[PDB]
Amino acid sequence: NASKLANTNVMVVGGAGFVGSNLVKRLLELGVNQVHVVDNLLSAEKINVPDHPAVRFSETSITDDALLASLQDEYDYVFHLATYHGNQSSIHDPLADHENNTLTTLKLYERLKHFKRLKKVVYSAAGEETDIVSLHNNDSPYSMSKIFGEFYSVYYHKQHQLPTVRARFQNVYGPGEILGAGRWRGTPATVWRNVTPTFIYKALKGMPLPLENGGVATRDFIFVEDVANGLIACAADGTPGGVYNIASGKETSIADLATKINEITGNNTELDRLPKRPWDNSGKRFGSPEKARRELGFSADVSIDDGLRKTIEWTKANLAVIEQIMRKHDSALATY
Amino acid sequence: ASKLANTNVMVVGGAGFVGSNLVKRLLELGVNQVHVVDNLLSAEKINVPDHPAVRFSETSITDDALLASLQDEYDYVFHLATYHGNQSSIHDPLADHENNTLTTLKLYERLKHFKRLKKVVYSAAGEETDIVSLHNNDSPYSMSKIFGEFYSVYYHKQHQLPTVRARFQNVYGPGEILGAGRWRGTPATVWRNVTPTFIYKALKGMPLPLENGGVATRDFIFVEDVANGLIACAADGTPGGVYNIASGKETSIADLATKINEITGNNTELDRLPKRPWDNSGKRFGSPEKARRELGFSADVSIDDGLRKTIEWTKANLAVIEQIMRKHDSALATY
Numbered sequence A: 001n002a003s004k005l006a007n008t009n010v011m012v013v014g015g016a017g018f019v020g021s022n023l024v025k026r027l028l029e030l031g032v033n034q035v036h037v038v039d040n041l042l043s044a045e046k047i048n049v050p051d052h053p054a055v056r057f058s059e060t061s062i063t064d065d066a067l068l069a070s071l072q073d074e075y076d077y078v079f080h081l082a083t084y085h086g087n088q089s090s091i092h093d094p095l096a097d098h099e100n101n102t103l104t105t106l107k108l109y110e111r112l113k114h115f116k117r118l119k120k121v122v123y124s125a126a127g128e129e130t131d132i133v134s135l136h137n138n139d140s141p142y143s144m145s146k147i148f149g150e151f152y153s154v155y156y157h158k159q160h161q162l163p164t165v166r167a168r169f170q171n172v173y174g175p176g177e178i179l180g181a182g183r184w185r186g187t188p189a190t191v192w193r194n195v196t197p198t199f200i201y202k203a204l205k206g207m208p209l210p211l212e213n214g215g216v217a218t219r220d221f222i223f224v225e226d227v228a229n230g231l232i233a234c235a236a237d238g239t240p241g242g243v244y245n246i247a248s249g250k251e252t253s254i255a256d257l258a259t260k261i262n263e264i265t266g267n268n269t270e271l272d273r274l275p276k277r278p279w280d281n282s283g284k285r286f287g288s289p290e291k292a293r294r295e296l297g298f299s300a301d302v303s304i305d306d307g308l309r310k311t312i313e314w315t316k317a318n319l320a321v322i323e324q325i326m327r328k329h330d331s332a333l334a335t336y
Numbered sequence B: 001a002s003k004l005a006n007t008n009v010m011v012v013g014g015a016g017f018v019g020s021n022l023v024k025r026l027l028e029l030g031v032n033q034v035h036v037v038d039n040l041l042s043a044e045k046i047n048v049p050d051h052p053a054v055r056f057s058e059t060s061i062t063d064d065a066l067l068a069s070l071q072d073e074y075d076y077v078f079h080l081a082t083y084h085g086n087q088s089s090i091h092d093p094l095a096d097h098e099n100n101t102l103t104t105l106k107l108y109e110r111l112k113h114f115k116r117l118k119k120v121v122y123s124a125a126g127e128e129t130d131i132v133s134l135h136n137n138d139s140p141y142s143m144s145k146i147f148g149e150f151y152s153v154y155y156h157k158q159h160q161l162p163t164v165r166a167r168f169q170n171v172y173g174p175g176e177i178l179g180a181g182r183w184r185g186t187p188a189t190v191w192r193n194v195t196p197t198f199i200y201k202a203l204k205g206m207p208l209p210l211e212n213g214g215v216a217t218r219d220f221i222f223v224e225d226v227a228n229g230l231i232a233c234a235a236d237g238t239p240g241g242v243y244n245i246a247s248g249k250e251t252s253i254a255d256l257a258t259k260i261n262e263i264t265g266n267n268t269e270l271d272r273l274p275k276r277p278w279d280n281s282g283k284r285f286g287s288p289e290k291a292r293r294e295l296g297f298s299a300d301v302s303i304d305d306g307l308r309k310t311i312e313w314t315k316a317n318l319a320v321i322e323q324i325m326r327k328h329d330s331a332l333a334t335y
Ligand SMILES: NC(=O)c1ccc[n+]([C@@H]2O[C@H](COP(=O)([O-])OP(=O)(O)OC[C@H]3O[C@@H](n4cnc5c(N)ncnc54)[C@H](O)[C@@H]3O)[C@@H](O)[C@H]2O)c1
Pocket: A013, A014, A015, A016, A017, A018, A019, A020, A038, A039, A040, A041, A042, A043, A044, A060, A061, A062, A063, A080, A081, A082, A083, A084, A085, A099, A100, A101, A104, A124, A125, A126, A127, A146, A169, A170, A171, A172, A173, A182
């Protein structure tokens, strides 16, 4: 049913970003009529927005009142991917997080509530689906903002029939995640965004991979192209008011991540890994991909090896530009 | 309670119903100073006493200049501001967010630097658990109240802000003024809650608009008990903790109406129906046992006594209450 999006008008809030740019690429592949990207480039690079006849780019916050007022009821689908990137940035400035991570969703939904052409509004939430949450689980304002967007998604559906679908995912990696993308957001994580691109960049430079705690921790990585397809499946076939895990169902240890990256890149430097013991990942739960498979026919099948090969090829091909982007934060990094 | 003697206290939302009662009790307790911060969005200035120990900032707590001007000179902060209430919030979720979610966040973001604070008490909505459903929330107001609990837990864990969440519901008593504040979009601005609506109507000798035979029950709690409960939270509540401040006693709306009529001498009819098992089934009231055990707090004002006090206050102030109600006449007529 991904062809349901053929010849439709789509908005992608946060569409200049990592997941967003990949979603935009896939929408254009599927033959959408128009993509309206709304993105303030707070954590993104304009090089991730194509200069394409189906792509309209509004370089403005989705909280901007004038922008919101200017929106017309001409969208079939909306993908809400904006966030304040990410955990560490949000701890550093909870008010910057609120503006770009909680208020975004509320103001977007308040404008959309009277749009009648809307078939689905897909919200990227953070990471068997249950709708019970703990007040204690939340390590950052980012994590609270993500949860709050689910509260809003449920409310706008119940009260106003906004056809929301919540897509939960975690540990996305792949082409288009640029270290240093966007503005300085307070901490070194602006540069070193996530473990996979940090390790790829370091391995391409022939640097030893800074492996923490022997790399015993595991993550369910998911390739960004699979996430894009999962978000599309939610739009086309997800139940309004509903939620879906968009997940690989496969765990990789950080040590094995490092090893694969080193092997593919030919980075012949040491790795300080340790054997996993029963106490190392004992509490850990990963999201089941079963609901999305059963109800949407969606399966995230790109293997970690194939995904890493693609990501590494893209990173190598763009290494100079990535480095120019990272370097803009040299001063802020030095004084942190 | 006397732990607060001679302390400096801030009451955000201190001009409102619960707030004004809390401020009165704090003064009785002999606090050094109360700083009330209130934009009067749902409140009346006559609920702010002229008293040498009260300072009044007629300003939103989200105002940056006000926040920046605050100094680390408070022993206790009571955060009572909200966007009153469910109905208003549904009408305008953005007005709610500004006065109900953003309030908490910006307040906490300022206070996290303050090391004189012993306790920060947040009035949340109604054994205590910290698990919530994404589905339980009928309104933006409801979401904002829950969000404030999330923030309270976070700021304690991350920044050691000594928060205590106080959960209550169905407060009634002197100082709740029908029509208080600005028009917030719906007739609930006037007809705020069932108790003051019924008291007012009974005093005017009008039939009480009892809905569905009054089979619904509520755990009403008298406002002075809520104020003492908040104080017990401040003095002795565990940082990061939560306590139900509750009566543990249910009254049907039909019995509420009957009592109000009996006290006021309102001789008009009442359409009551008998309560059946399927009428309140599964409705849960908050246990007051944790607050009793840990803080020695119990809410002992009976419904009969509280209603008497409330009716007396209303009768005493009926003229001013009506003048306050009447400012919303045009807005009511067009709703
Ligand atoms: N990458 C992951 O592993 C991961 C995991 C779980 C959930 N998510 C969610 O997926 C979404 C996309 O994340 P990402 O990894 O692509 O990060 P990203 O930072 O690359 O993308 C987010 C985009 O939002 C934009 N933005 C920020 N504030 C805005 C505002 N006020 N108005 C409009 N646009 C704004 C940024 O400039 C950026 O382009 C986010 O909602 C994120 O929380 C991501």
